[PDB]
């Protein structure tokens, strides 16, 4: 999986 998928939720801000 992508660690960046769940994490772009907040990371995209």
Request: without cysteine.
């Amino acid at each position: 999986f992508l660690p960046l998928i769940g994490r772009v939720l907040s990371g995209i801000l």
